[PDB]
Structure formats: structure tokens, C-alpha cells
């Protein structure tokens, strides 16, 4: 599964892996709410936002992110 920016893909995988384990074992079992995947997320999201800055889609996304469709 690829990132829109290929150079982020490997940071995505390691984030996803970690979250996949956190979600199944900790979150849905009601054990944890803690972001156990801090640094994988931070690395990943840093790469991805840097990639996003050069992107035309980014103001549409920034506007979309401030809608709450389950209002």
C-alpha cells in the first residue's frame, strides 16, 4: 500500500503496522487510549506534510478537515 509521495511509503508501513497492533490488541479491548505509536506517527506525518506543502490539493484538504460531517 503506497503513499501519494513514494518516499513516505516506508514510514507509512511502520506507522500502520504499529497502529494495526495497537488498534486490535489495545484499543478495541478497551485497554488503552494512549498513542503508543508516537514516533512512527511523527516521522511519517512529518514526511507526508512536507510532501503536501508542494501540492495543489492542500487548501481543499485544509478546508475539508474543518468540516465535521457527523454534525
Amino acid at each position: 500500500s503506497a503513499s501519494f509521495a513514494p518516499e513516505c511509503t516506508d514510514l507509512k508501513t511502520k506507522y500502520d503496522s504499529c497502529f494495526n497492533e495497537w488498534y486490535s490488541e489495545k484499543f478495541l479491548k478497551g485497554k488503552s487510549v494512549e498513542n503508543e505509536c508516537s514516533k512512527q506517527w511523527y516521522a511519517y506525518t512529518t514526511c507526508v506534510n512536507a510532501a503536501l506543502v508542494k501540492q495543489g490539493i492542500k487548501p481543499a484538504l485544509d478546508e475539508a478537515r474543518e468540516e465535521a460531517p457527523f454534525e
Partner: protein
Amino acid sequence: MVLLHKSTHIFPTDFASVSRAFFNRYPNPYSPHVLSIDTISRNVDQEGNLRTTRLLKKSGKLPTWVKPFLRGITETWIIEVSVVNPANSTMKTYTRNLDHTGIMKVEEYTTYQFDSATSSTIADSRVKFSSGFNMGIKSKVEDWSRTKFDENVKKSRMGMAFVIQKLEEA
């Protein structure tokens, strides 16, 4: 012009399998046009729920008649928003194209809900096609919408089926 479609599917599986599959939908053979998907934000809100916002890039091909009038578009960005309530085994999903909005806006609400009695996960979908800037007689736009709704009902349900099977196969 506005069109609404409703569908409903029952996954005979538990909420964990179904939700974990939603987050792990791609890639799968029923969604080859999906090029990427990235997690923009994710956090637990004040009521115990998991809020996710993801970003997808998807390729497409307009139907031919429309082509002169448009405007050379292949790709589209799609935003995916989701809330997971683990105390109710409830997931709410909302997607929509981020771009080409002025041409055609396609929103989708899908609700996944575990029914303990039938030991199954009910997914209800509502899809909203909105279009001002009519451009062409609606019937082709309405038919295009029927064709895309029906194609994505099968694609998403087969894709989820697939992913669930293979996630348990481990």
C-alpha cells in the same frame, strides 16, 4: 441536480474484523484504481472514540461523450473521515472528492454497526451525487451516477470481504 442512493450489506463477522478491515481496505483487487492512501490525522476524542482523517488518490476515466466539454481530468483526491466507537461497536465513515467539486460532488456515508443478536455487522450506505454546473442533459449524469453507485457497492463489499478473509487467514 441531486441524486441519492441507499444500499445495505450484512457482514457476518465481528466489529473488530470489519473495522480493522476498513482501515486496511487497500490495496485489494477490487480497487485497482486506488493509487494511494495516507493518514492525515488520527486521535482519540473526549468520549473514547477514534477519529481518523485519511487522504486517497484515485484514478478514473470519464465517459466519452463528456470528454470534449471536459477538461482533461484523470485523477481525483478523496477525503475519508471516520469515527470508531468501541463501546458501541459503531463505525461512521464519510468520504468525498476534494477536487472537481464544481463539476460533480460525490459524498458517501457508510455506517458499520454490530448487531449482537444476529452476531453480524450491518453496513448501511448513502451516496449523494450533487451537480450544479449541469453542463449536459441530466439523464446521462443520472445514468452515470447509477452506474458508479452500483459499481462501488460491489467493489467496496467484495473488497471488504476479501480483506476480512485474508486478515483472518493469518
